[PDB]
Write an enzyme that holds these catalytic residues in place. Structure first.
Site, PDB file in Angstrom:
ATOM      1  N   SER A 196     -75.615 -95.437  58.681  1.00  0.00           N
ATOM      2  CA  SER A 196     -75.012 -94.228  58.143  1.00  0.00           C
ATOM      3  C   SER A 196     -74.273 -93.488  59.250  1.00  0.00           C
ATOM      4  O   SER A 196     -74.865 -93.171  60.327  1.00  0.00           O
ATOM      5  CB  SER A 196     -76.095 -93.289  57.551  1.00  0.00           C
ATOM      6  OG  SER A 196     -76.845 -93.904  56.515  1.00  0.00           O
ATOM      7  N   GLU A 252     -72.144 -96.880  55.782  1.00  0.00           N
ATOM      8  CA  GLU A 252     -72.219 -95.809  54.795  1.00  0.00           C
ATOM      9  C   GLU A 252     -71.735 -94.549  55.453  1.00  0.00           C
ATOM     10  O   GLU A 252     -72.309 -94.154  56.495  1.00  0.00           O
ATOM     11  CB  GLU A 252     -73.664 -95.589  54.288  1.00  0.00           C
ATOM     12  CG  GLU A 252     -73.811 -94.316  53.469  1.00  0.00           C
ATOM     13  CD  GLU A 252     -75.244 -93.976  53.074  1.00  0.00           C
ATOM     14  OE1 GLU A 252     -76.103 -93.952  53.992  1.00  0.00           O
ATOM     15  OE2 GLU A 252     -75.500 -93.698  51.865  1.00  0.00           O
ATOM     16  N   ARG A 256     -71.661 -90.681  55.252  1.00  0.00           N
ATOM     17  CA  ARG A 256     -72.244 -89.467  54.670  1.00  0.00           C
ATOM     18  C   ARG A 256     -71.223 -88.334  54.652  1.00  0.00           C
ATOM     19  O   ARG A 256     -71.039 -87.531  55.621  1.00  0.00           O
ATOM     20  CB  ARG A 256     -73.529 -89.116  55.453  1.00  0.00           C
ATOM     21  CG  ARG A 256     -74.666 -90.092  55.169  1.00  0.00           C
ATOM     22  CD  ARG A 256     -75.334 -89.821  53.821  1.00  0.00           C
ATOM     23  NE  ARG A 256     -75.716 -88.411  53.723  1.00  0.00           N
ATOM     24  CZ  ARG A 256     -76.819 -87.874  54.249  1.00  0.00           C
ATOM     25  NH1 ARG A 256     -77.710 -88.626  54.887  1.00  0.00           N
ATOM     26  NH2 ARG A 256     -77.051 -86.564  54.126  1.00  0.00           N
ATOM     27  N   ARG A 301     -74.090 -87.049  49.635  1.00  0.00           N
ATOM     28  CA  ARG A 301     -75.490 -86.861  49.277  1.00  0.00           C
ATOM     29  C   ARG A 301     -75.584 -85.352  48.928  1.00  0.00           C
ATOM     30  O   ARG A 301     -75.216 -84.526  49.730  1.00  0.00           O
ATOM     31  CB  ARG A 301     -76.412 -87.224  50.439  1.00  0.00           C
ATOM     32  CG  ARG A 301     -77.901 -87.098  50.110  1.00  0.00           C
ATOM     33  CD  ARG A 301     -78.394 -88.013  48.964  1.00  0.00           C
ATOM     34  NE  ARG A 301     -78.129 -89.435  49.202  1.00  0.00           N
ATOM     35  CZ  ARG A 301     -77.376 -90.191  48.404  1.00  0.00           C
ATOM     36  NH1 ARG A 301     -76.858 -89.661  47.326  1.00  0.00           N
ATOM     37  NH2 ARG A 301     -77.166 -91.479  48.671  1.00  0.00           N
ATOM     38  N   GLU A 358     -80.812 -83.553  46.774  1.00  0.00           N
ATOM     39  CA  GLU A 358     -81.454 -84.773  47.264  1.00  0.00           C
ATOM     40  C   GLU A 358     -81.323 -84.963  48.778  1.00  0.00           C
ATOM     41  O   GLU A 358     -81.200 -86.063  49.288  1.00  0.00           O
ATOM     42  CB  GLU A 358     -80.992 -85.985  46.449  1.00  0.00           C
ATOM     43  CG  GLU A 358     -81.512 -85.892  44.991  1.00  0.00           C
ATOM     44  CD  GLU A 358     -81.224 -87.128  44.139  1.00  0.00           C
ATOM     45  OE1 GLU A 358     -81.192 -88.231  44.666  1.00  0.00           O
ATOM     46  OE2 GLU A 358     -81.174 -86.987  42.920  1.00  0.00           O
ATOM     47  N   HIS A 399     -83.110 -90.062  45.972  1.00  0.00           N
ATOM     48  CA  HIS A 399     -83.805 -89.976  47.241  1.00  0.00           C
ATOM     49  C   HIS A 399     -84.828 -88.891  47.024  1.00  0.00           C
ATOM     50  O   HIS A 399     -84.461 -87.860  46.518  1.00  0.00           O
ATOM     51  CB  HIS A 399     -82.885 -89.532  48.371  1.00  0.00           C
ATOM     52  CG  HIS A 399     -82.010 -90.604  48.907  1.00  0.00           C
ATOM     53  ND1 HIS A 399     -80.937 -91.099  48.205  1.00  0.00           N
ATOM     54  CD2 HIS A 399     -82.008 -91.242  50.105  1.00  0.00           C
ATOM     55  CE1 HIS A 399     -80.325 -92.014  48.934  1.00  0.00           C
ATOM     56  NE2 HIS A 399     -80.968 -92.129  50.083  1.00  0.00           N
ATOM     57  N   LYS A 407     -80.658 -97.937  43.729  1.00  0.00           N
ATOM     58  CA  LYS A 407     -81.241 -97.659  45.019  1.00  0.00           C
ATOM     59  C   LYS A 407     -82.202 -96.469  44.948  1.00  0.00           C
ATOM     60  O   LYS A 407     -81.821 -95.429  44.430  1.00  0.00           O
ATOM     61  CB  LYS A 407     -80.191 -97.304  46.058  1.00  0.00           C
ATOM     62  CG  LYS A 407     -80.831 -96.882  47.377  1.00  0.00           C
ATOM     63  CD  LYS A 407     -79.831 -96.310  48.386  1.00  0.00           C
ATOM     64  CE  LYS A 407     -80.452 -95.327  49.395  1.00  0.00           C
ATOM     65  NZ  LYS A 407     -79.377 -94.935  50.313  1.00  0.00           N
ATOM     66  N   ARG A 439     -88.880-101.586  54.952  1.00  0.00           N
ATOM     67  CA  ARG A 439     -87.553-101.923  55.491  1.00  0.00           C
ATOM     68  C   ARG A 439     -87.493-103.359  55.965  1.00  0.00           C
ATOM     69  O   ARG A 439     -86.430-103.823  56.257  1.00  0.00           O
ATOM     70  CB  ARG A 439     -87.218-101.038  56.705  1.00  0.00           C
ATOM     71  CG  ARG A 439     -87.237 -99.535  56.438  1.00  0.00           C
ATOM     72  CD  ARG A 439     -86.838 -98.818  57.717  1.00  0.00           C
ATOM     73  NE  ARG A 439     -87.103 -97.377  57.637  1.00  0.00           N
ATOM     74  CZ  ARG A 439     -86.178 -96.431  57.563  1.00  0.00           C
ATOM     75  NH1 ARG A 439     -84.886 -96.736  57.675  1.00  0.00           N
ATOM     76  NH2 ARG A 439     -86.569 -95.154  57.461  1.00  0.00           N
ATOM     77  N   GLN A 448     -87.412 -95.492  61.656  1.00  0.00           N
ATOM     78  CA  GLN A 448     -86.063 -96.030  61.654  1.00  0.00           C
ATOM     79  C   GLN A 448     -85.916 -96.876  62.933  1.00  0.00           C
ATOM     80  O   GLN A 448     -86.221 -96.414  64.055  1.00  0.00           O
ATOM     81  CB  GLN A 448     -85.087 -94.875  61.641  1.00  0.00           C
ATOM     82  CG  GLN A 448     -83.631 -95.229  61.454  1.00  0.00           C
ATOM     83  CD  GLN A 448     -82.766 -94.070  61.857  1.00  0.00           C
ATOM     84  OE1 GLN A 448     -83.172 -93.248  62.708  1.00  0.00           O
ATOM     85  NE2 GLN A 448     -81.596 -93.954  61.244  1.00  0.00           N
TER      86      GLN A 448
HETATM   87 NI    NI Z   1     -79.956 -93.274  51.653  1.00  0.00          NI
END
Ligand code: NI
Ligand code: NI
Ligand code: NI
Ligand code: NI
Ligand code: NI
Ligand code: NI
Lengths: 251, 249
Positions: B21, B46, B48, B82, B86, B143, B170, B213, B233
């Protein structure tokens, strides 16, 4: 509570890596040990059911001694796996206990594996004999056809603690993906409800390999790696296992 | 069962794919991050968009898209606003949200857009139709940053995402207990086994949720998230390493 064998502390930090030596003859045992010497693992399990002269006490004693001379800085786990529970051969109850008793006497092993379903009296007495000599006990159970209910897995691990295991151990076979989660659920519930020592849990085969990596989060204190050949389906190479465990430990 | 191809990337097949992201407030920030992400080992970028400052000014958003595109030329680009409700940085009305997403669709610069499940059925469904008319794929998302719904409800949300036309449903949830992580996996497995006819992505957050993950190939999640460089992460490199280990096991 943790368990200290040789100089290794089981129960804290990252899961520890166990590898198994399988040697038919003493020549094979020494050659596999030489090949293992440098590998990155924490505990060396000698799979004695793979050894031809298991019924000859001097051969067994010599073998243990050869291993101990090659691998000098790792705790040595003595394990006879019964055919009952996925091993290479069967022995009477009496032979099984005597083999483990002789291993305790040798002064060459740090731990012995005792199968929970061996028999309560025998197991209690063998645990007693082992502790009498500062030898730790991994108590074990394996279900190679299926995954019992989560509650049943939990009661067996609890029963190992009652019998005096220093480290309860259970290996079950998944028939579905949910079966792997059942094994992890049971590990968590055991840790939450009864565990007062490290425990080791795993789901076998390719489908359960994930269970051999997440113990730090779900509660299993050790995991089996392969040096070349797995000792039970689902083991991955020792190098890759350490890599993954470290990454998760620091995640 | 379907796979979903975005450019030359096949989602739903083999090892799960890695999404990173990108967050930037201004075009200068965006360029800086795109440059840094350029040689990292990930599959889908991705963006954001909710981090970008004035999203109601369409041209700026479009000029930023163009920049990302010029720097990251090979990877599929996912456009994601987003929303506040969320975990997002800022509020847009439903109309503004839909217009933004259609502008991204019209630009030809993005490969996929994210539409939230809880945006409004009518709106979502028409926009899914609009994206498809332009060969743009849709990841439909939910999310929950503070808890883990029950498995039945996680499954219900994923089923609805399919009903609404998502190319890739997702869901990402936050565990409060280790059990919650197992709940998310259980939902993943039941969705695969019983209702899924397309790739789905699921994730439990935090350190406790990390298994989620890594285990996408066994349990049924088609993609996972990592960092180019947050609890649980891991780096793109480490994540590729583990996914490869699991895939070759
Ligand atoms: Ni996400
Ligand atoms: Ni540490
Ligand atoms: Ni003695
Ligand atoms: Ni492959
Ligand atoms: Ni058009
Ligand atoms: Ni909420």
């Amino acid at each position: 509570k943790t368990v200290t064998v040789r100089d290794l502390v089981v129960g804290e930090g990252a899961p520890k890596i166990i590898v198994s030596l399988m040697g038919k003859t003493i020549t094979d045992v020494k050659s596999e040990a030489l090949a293992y010497r440098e590998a990155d693992f924490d505990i060396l399990e000698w799979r004695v059911d793979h050894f031809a002269n298991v019924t000859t006490a001097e051969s067994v004693l010599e073998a243990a001694g050869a291993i101990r001379e090659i691998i000098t800085d790792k705790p040595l786990l003595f394990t006879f796996r019964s055919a009952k529970e996925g091993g290479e051969q069967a022995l009477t109850t009496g032979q099984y206990i005597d083999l483990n008793r002789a291993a305790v006497d040798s002064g060459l092993v740090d731990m012995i594996d005792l199968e929970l379903f061996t028999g309560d009296d025998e197991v209690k007495a063998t645990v007693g004999y082992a502790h009498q000599h500062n030898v730790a006990v991994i108590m074990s159970n394996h279900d190679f056809h299926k995954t019992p209910a989560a509650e049943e897995i939990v009661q067996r691990l609890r029963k190992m603690q009652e019998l005096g295991a220093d480290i309860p151990k259970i290996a079950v076979m998944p028939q579905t993906k949910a079966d792997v989660l059942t094994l992890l659920t049971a590990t968590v519930e055991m840790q939450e409800r009864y565990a007062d020592r490290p425990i080791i849990t795993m789901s076998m085969s390719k489908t359960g390999v994930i269970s051999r990596l997440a113990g730090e989060v779900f509660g299993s204190a050790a995991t089996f790696g392969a040096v070349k050949k797995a000792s039970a389906p689902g083991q991955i190479s020792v190098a890759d296992l350490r890599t993954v465990l470290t990454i998760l430990h620091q995640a």
